[PDB]
Amino acid sequence: RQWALEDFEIGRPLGKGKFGNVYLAREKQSKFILALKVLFKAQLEKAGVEHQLRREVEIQSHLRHPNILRLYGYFHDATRVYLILEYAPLGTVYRELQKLSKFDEQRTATYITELANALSYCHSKRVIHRDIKPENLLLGSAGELKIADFGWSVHGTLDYLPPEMIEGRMHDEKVDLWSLGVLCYEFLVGKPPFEANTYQETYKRISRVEFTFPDFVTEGARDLISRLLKHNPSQRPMLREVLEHPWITANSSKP
Numbered sequence: 001r002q003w004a005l006e007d008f009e010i011g012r013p014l015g016k017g018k019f020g021n022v023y024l025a026r027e028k029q030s031k032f033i034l035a036l037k038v039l040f041k042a043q044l045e046k047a048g049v050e051h052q053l054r055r056e057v058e059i060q061s062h063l064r065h066p067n068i069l070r071l072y073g074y075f076h077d078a079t080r081v082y083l084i085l086e087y088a089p090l091g092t093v094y095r096e097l098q099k100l101s102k103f104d105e106q107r108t109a110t111y112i113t114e115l116a117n118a119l120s121y122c123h124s125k126r127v128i129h130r131d132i133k134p135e136n137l138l139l140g141s142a143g144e145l146k147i148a149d150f151g152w153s154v155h156g157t158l159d160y161l162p163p164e165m166i167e168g169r170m171h172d173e174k175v176d177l178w179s180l181g182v183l184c185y186e187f188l189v190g191k192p193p194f195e196a197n198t199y200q201e202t203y204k205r206i207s208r209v210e211f212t213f214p215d216f217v218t219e220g221a222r223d224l225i226s227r228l229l230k231h232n233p234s235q236r237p238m239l240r241e242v243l244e245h246p247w248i249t250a251n252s253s254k255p
């Protein structure tokens with residue numbers, strides 16, 4: 001408890017968003033390596049998010065799972081707000097997708113497994129993430145996936161939102177299964193299935209569930225993805241079925 005900036009040595013930048021940056025940092029007392037997201041109050045005000053940020057910080061501080069990024073604590077000063085985060089040494093799934101273009105089936109299935117675990121734990125707490133992008137997935141030091149950033153509700157680009165959300169209607173914990181499908185596709189294909197040059201058209205493509213597989217996408221992967229990317233949230237499987245999908249169990253690296 002009770003942390004101030006004078007308690008940390010700052011290091012190189014690890015990333016930069018529209019509300020301040022993440023830095024590598026060390027805790028002076030214990031020599032703990034961590035990340036330090038710095039957000040600017042002046043800018044958090046002008047967007048009107050001080051409340052949503054508090055609600056998300058509140059939600060994250062109670063979450064412990066090896067595939068969810070810890071929030072250790074937080075504090076603030078005259079102009080800024082600081083989140084103390086688990087440092088993930090192997091960087092973003094985004095950068096690793098740019099490096100390799102596509103992932104194979106073992107890596108995809110393994111990531112999808114770790115994601116579903118993290119989401120199942122999330123739903124047990126009745127928590128929905130509502131936005132899982134490769135930008136927001138980090139790699140721990142054994143390359144294990146870690147969901148970062150947000151945890152929006154209990155109740156930017158459109159590529160990852162399900163149709164109920166973009167149409168306005170109400171949305172179960174089932175929005176997370178659409179996202180799993182979008183990622184499973186993006187991991188194997190190298191781009192998300194509703195990508196498009198403009199927002200308004202990604203909208204149409206999402207709305208009507210208009211995607212096509214390249215030739216290399218195997219049968220088992222076509223099945224999982226297709227059973228996740230259903231317009232009626234009613235029809236998406238439970239994460240139990242995902243984790244026991246034959247394509248997953250055959251390709252997912254063993255526990």
Ligand SMILES: Nc1nc(Nc2ccc(S(N)(=O)=O)cc2)nn1C(=O)c1c(F)cccc1F
Pocket residue numbers: 014015016022023035037069085086087088089090091092095135136137138148149
């Ligand atoms: N908490 C956390 N750890 C990391 N680690 C990390 C390690 C290496 C690199 S790299 N290859 O040098 O660009 C990048 C990140 N990021 N991180 C963040 O919250 C974080 C994030 F979620 C998204 C984007 C940037 C971040 F900074």
Ligand SMILES: O=C(O)c1cc(-c2cc(F)cc(Cl)c2)nc2ccccc12
Pocket residue numbers: 041042044045050053054057074075076081
């Ligand atoms: O009124 C303040 O002092 C102020 C505080 C905070 C804040 C403090 C926390 F301990 C945790 C979190 Cl998540 C946010 N956020 C702000 C955003 C805009 C403007 C002012 C603030």
Ligand SMILES: [Mg+2]
Pocket residue numbers: none
């Ligand atoms: Mg206030």
